[PDB]
């Protein structure tokens, strides 16, 4: 990849910084362009990109460096000697590799590259392997256990034993009551291929990872240690010794919503979890009677590693923006370029906290975004190479370039469900122009790009706005939405935290209108925690749709030690806050509505809009109603003023809707829920709701140029809300 | 009905005594005698009923007595005087009434009925009522406080207050945030219409009904109820009062594996609930913090009280019958005789410890059929009642009768789900000869009549038994199964608790054989205590098939702690046991089998068996793979001799089974799921595992007078588990 980046922030208010962060490859530098984004679909048969550059607010050149990225997730002690007494050396732990075929991995190891001293334990299908450094004149030494390891908890260590003159590597199964027990070990004899380490051996201590970084392990570890000498007069674990005997023992319970590992010996050689492996999980001493690690954390004493976990790059920042105050609150980019290639890094100018400069609000849900950022779906096949070829699209997809890391919607390469998302390295599905669908009816975009439609309109239109992020309103809360006639969502605000939907409710209960102009909205709760800036945490537990399934009683966030996974399951149902719940899910494919209604409340928004049928058509699915639907906690003045049909077969019920294959929750049948139904009702507060209940929605907005029934639809509601 | 009863247990052994209660609305005297039940299904096309009578080991002539079933859950405080001072009286609750218009429903009363004094608080459709006797002469006193309450918590009192000589009649609501509280007070003079009560006036305190028989039984949560003697416009609750002035304040939050209501103030004036109402459900301060009742009892200071709740029936032991070491273990009951009418009690003779007196010993599953007990199905048309008639089977079914109450696949009648389930009560689904369905193409039976369909074909077939509950699992764990050379299980194994599940998992360790003989075993677990004997929880959590879905937070068991829900929800799924698990679900009709495998390991079952397909034909459903399916955690060496097929398009995948509507967890289409698959397996500790996975199975070895494919099949597995 040719030029990309990142800012540590998505987000900031007149006078906060944005600090941008850019890899070039190219020996020539870059510039920067400051830009305001209108339009982000590359379809030809919509209005295409459009930019409003602003060079004269920022511009620069920049020096190119291209810097690296590097997923798997590992423990780092750093600040420590090395390893080993004159009597010898053992160290070993409790592990459960979840992925065996993908290489040699480190269980632990310390390694002094240049003096060819240290020690490292991996495991591999070959078996358990004690690698031993041997001086700067031979290779190392190397001592193989074989034996066939599964997914199970087993217990490695080694022993450099000076007395006896052998060394030990064995591996025994945790659970003995299996029918075939591995218990296994390797001794050789010791012929002073091994001495005492002196004080220039000294290395880092890294637990998931060899540096000489490689291995990256593939698994959960739990209980760590290493000693110095022999256990007191079956593996040997840290319970069998001395604390002077002790060099340290790690307890992963401590500490489970950080990055530290807390060393429990009087050393109190800590340790930094890199790349944010998974923690909050089960523990070999799990039983199931604790569900909830806040309260039981010994069950909960294990950490999860993968080899393409991937938070924070690390990467140097290549110039910051302070927001001046003569800026108006807006989707910015920041473009870069250098030799023919073209970046563009998103970010959003907040208003400031009750001074709006609009009476609308546009609420970008980069919690959404963010969970799917760079989700590699697979389909970047010749097809879709080409059409984004065609339509000069972004040029690049996620499946082409894993180095970027995975969506919460992937799975890690052991299998296991990826649970978080880090804002902090290049997101791919972010760009203006990426195209995520091919999309045999329309554009195929979604989140960002797909965004960008609405926003498009509301300019075209001459509906001035400002823009807040999900980021925005956690930490501002409702009060920063109060000022504003109008708060309107993007197509998918599915993920949010307890803070967010308190905003959004407060806003409602001051009197607010809300346009929900999306579906599937107010679905997954998401964790974040001030310890781990710029990464979100995503749970499916239970029920619902879900591209994994949660293990049993891993079900509570380990950054903010919350219950996650469906909202419903936390006593919150989207219809509770837009009158409409998620109710169908099919193919990116759009249908289009009928109308019902004008004598009620509300039916002046369907002014002229002929019956019966509008919005067969969309950039989105080519229809205004498609993907994912919202039917009918729903007030009882819910007006439906619309309800789409003829949908694809392929379409299905959402699965939290039902208690069985043939009945929903309503206890009616499963075929009731094949339908988007738009909505208005009064809040009881002095405002309103409106929802479409339909990702695809906003993608009619720009048919038949902006003269359309959808872009009456939507002129209406929002006239209405702001008079 | 004529006569009916109950027994305290299910299952004795040798020297073990059984007590019997009878209740019969007829003069004359009844006649027991006791029977073994060989078969139970009154299908005149099959076997029929089938017993050997044994009125030598047990007959009796007994005096009759007609006994009650009263329905409707509360809690009563005993041995407590009048509550009222001179300076007056005060009483109230927090609570949230599910059910107003089901009628005049009591949240609190003191009725000494005789001396017409006492008070009771009532809410209904017309809102808040007060009550005051007003001694022999007159009728009650009646003050009103109309308001149209809503399934919210509301706070609600009455104050007699003799000072201001007023009495006062409130409620408002605890969520004051919403944007239309409810907040309304009736005032009325009091103008000496009361008094302080007498030595002579003391009654009990009753909290969810009223004595004056009990009536008004209320529907939905209570929170927090209160009496004081004193004083202390919003609701004064018990916080308000001096120590002095209180009466009674009790907590719910204390106790809630238990039956006892607590009372803090030093009265120490306790109250004991009956007939189970729910515990361990959400309280007013719940916010989604904690979801464990056990680490957070503050959030789960409610009880939920239902006008159906129904445990313990409280009858009289009519006669008892102790075992005699002479009497095999087998599946007996009493028949019991009036006037034309019959029924019977259906019971267990169990072996003796380590004194097996058979090879093989069958499961009797009595926690699964206690979850079912007195399903009203609500399918007891004409036409169902008609062949109820034409087969002479039993002529009485849970429909027409409200009074035995409900299973837990029911829901209360204010719309909560049925979560605990009395075996101390007549269970007319547990009778020989109750049909559950009108079954086109077969008997349409279930559960302990359908699985006497195996025992009757064990004993034709010359295999002798001996048979076990749950409960006995429960009570002994594996060591009793270890014995035996093979078990046996019923139709539908569904429910179990942890300890029946180890139980059969260490037979297995043991090197026992395990012979799955039904359908959608090993899914649901079940709560029970000691505290509470007779009782069985269920608690319907997360996903899966179910008649109803429990709520956010309420999903650990009251009456033992545990976390409730699929198996699977607790990280043990069917397929660990018996290498399938549930996969597809659909209405009570049966296909056929076809055979894949005679090379592989236990392919000599197959033999007799001719290609291709086999089975097409039983008792239930009229083929031998129906109704619910268990197709292939599991071994390697699992394996398949036989897959259904040409099941009809009313079938459907099991929810918990899916990622979404169109992948399954396995990640493949879920048209997969639909099939039954019999497979074999080494356990590799010395046994094997044959599994059929289907319910409708053994109602096919009753078929073509016991010569048939799959009564062969069976004795190939039965003979093979016995050398």
Avoid at 67 to 81: D, I, Q, Y
Avoid at 365 to 375: C, D, E, K, P, R
Avoid at 668 to 680: A, F, G, N, Q
């Amino acid at each position: 990849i040719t030029i990309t980046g990142y800012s540590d922030v998505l987000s900031a208010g007149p006078g906060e910084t944005v600090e941008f962060k850019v890899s070039s490859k190219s020996p020539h530098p870059f510039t920067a362009e400051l830009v305001r984004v209108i339009h982000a679909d590359p379809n030809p048969a919509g209005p295409g990109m459009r930019f409003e550059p602003l060079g004269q607010v920022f511009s620069g050149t920049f020096a190119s460096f291209d810097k690296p990225l590097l997923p798997g997730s590992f423990a780092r002690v750093s600040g420590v000697p090395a390893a080993g007494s004159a009597a010898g050396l053992v160290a070993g732990a409790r592990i459960r590799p979840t992925a065996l075929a993908r290489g040699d991995q480190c269980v632990m190891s310390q390694w002094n590259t240049a003096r060819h001293a240290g020690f490292a334990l991996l495991v591999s299908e070959r078996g358990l392997e004690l690698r031993l450094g041997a001086g700067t004149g031979e290779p190392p030494v190397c001592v193989l256990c074989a034996a066939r390891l599964e997914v199970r908890w087993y217990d490695v260590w080694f022993a450099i034993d000076t007395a006896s003159n052998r060394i030990e590597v064995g591996v025994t199964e945790v659970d003995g009551s299996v029918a075939a027990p591995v218990r296994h070990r390797t001794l050789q004899m010791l012929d002073a291929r091994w001495r005492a380490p002196h004080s220039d051996d000294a290395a880092d201590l890294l637990i998931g990872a060899l540096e000489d970084r490689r291995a990256h392990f593939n698994g959960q570890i739990e209980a760590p240690f290493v000693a110095d000498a022999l256990p007191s007069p079956a593996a040997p674990r840290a319970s069998d010794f001395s604390t002077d005997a002790l060099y340290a023992a790690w307890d992963f319970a401590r500490g489970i919503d950080t990055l530290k590992i807390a060393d429990t010996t009087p050393h109190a050689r800590h340790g930094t979890l890199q790349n944010l492996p998974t923690r909050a999980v089960r523990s070999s001493a799990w039983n199931g009677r604790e569900r909830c690690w806040r309260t039981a954390p010994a069950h909960y004493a294990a950490i999860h590693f993968h080899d393409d976990d991937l938070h924070d790059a690390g990467w140097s920042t290549d110039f910051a923006f302070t927001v001046p105050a003569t800026l108006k609150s807006g989707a910015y980019a920041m473009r870069l370029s250098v030799d023919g290639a073209t970046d563009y890094l998103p970010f959003y100018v907040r208003p400031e906290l009750g001074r709006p400069g609009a009476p609308l609000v546009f609420v970008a849900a980069t919690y959404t975004y963010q969970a799917y950022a760079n989700y590699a779906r697979g389909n970047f096949d010749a097809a879709l190479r080409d059409k984004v070829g065609r339509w000069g699209a972004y040029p690049h997809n996620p499946d082409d370039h894993p180095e970027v890391g995975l969506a919460t919607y992937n799975l890690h390469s052991d299998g296991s469900g990826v649970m978080f998302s880090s804002r902090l390295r290049p997101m791919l599905t972010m760009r203006p122009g990426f195209l995520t669908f091919d999309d045999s009816r329309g554009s195929g975009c979604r989140h960002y790009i797909a965004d960008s439609h609405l926003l498009d309109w509301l300019e075209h239109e001459g509906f001035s706005f400002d823009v807040v992020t999900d980021d925005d309103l956690e930490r501002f809360g409702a009060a920063l939405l109060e000022p504003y006639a109008a708060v309107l969502t993007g197509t998918h605000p599915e993920y949010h935290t307890a803070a967010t939907l308190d905003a959004l409710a407060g806003y409602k209960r001051s009197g607010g209108n809300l346009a929900y102009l999306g579906g599937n909205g107010f679905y997954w709760r998401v964790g974040r925690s001030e310890r781990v800036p710029g990464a979100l945490e995503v749970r499916r537990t239970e029920g619902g749709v879900r591209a994994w399934a949660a293990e049993a009683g891993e079900y509570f966030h380990a950054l903010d030690g919350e219950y996650g996974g469906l909202w419903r399951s936390s006593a919150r149902t989207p219809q509770q806050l837009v009158g409409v719940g998620f109710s169908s899910q099919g193919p990116f494919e759009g249908s289009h509505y009928r109308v019902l209604a004008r004598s009620q409340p509300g039916g002046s928004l369907l002014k002229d809009i002929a019956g019966p049928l509008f919005g067969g058509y969309g950039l989105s699915g080519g229809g205004a109603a498609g993907f994912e639907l919202d039917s009918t906690g729903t007030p009882a003045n819910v007006i439906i003023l619309a309800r789409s049909e003829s949908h694809s077969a392929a379409f299905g019920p959402a699965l939290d809707a039902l208690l069985s294959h043939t009945a929903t929750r309503a206890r009616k049948t499963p075929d009731t829920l094949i339908r988007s139904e738009i909505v208005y009702y009064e809040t009881g507060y002095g405002g309103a709701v409106f929802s479409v209940g339909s990702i695809t929605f906003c993608g009619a907005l720009s048919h038949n140029d902006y003269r359309n029934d959808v872009s009456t639809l939507l002129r209406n509601v929002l006239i209405r809300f702001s008079r």
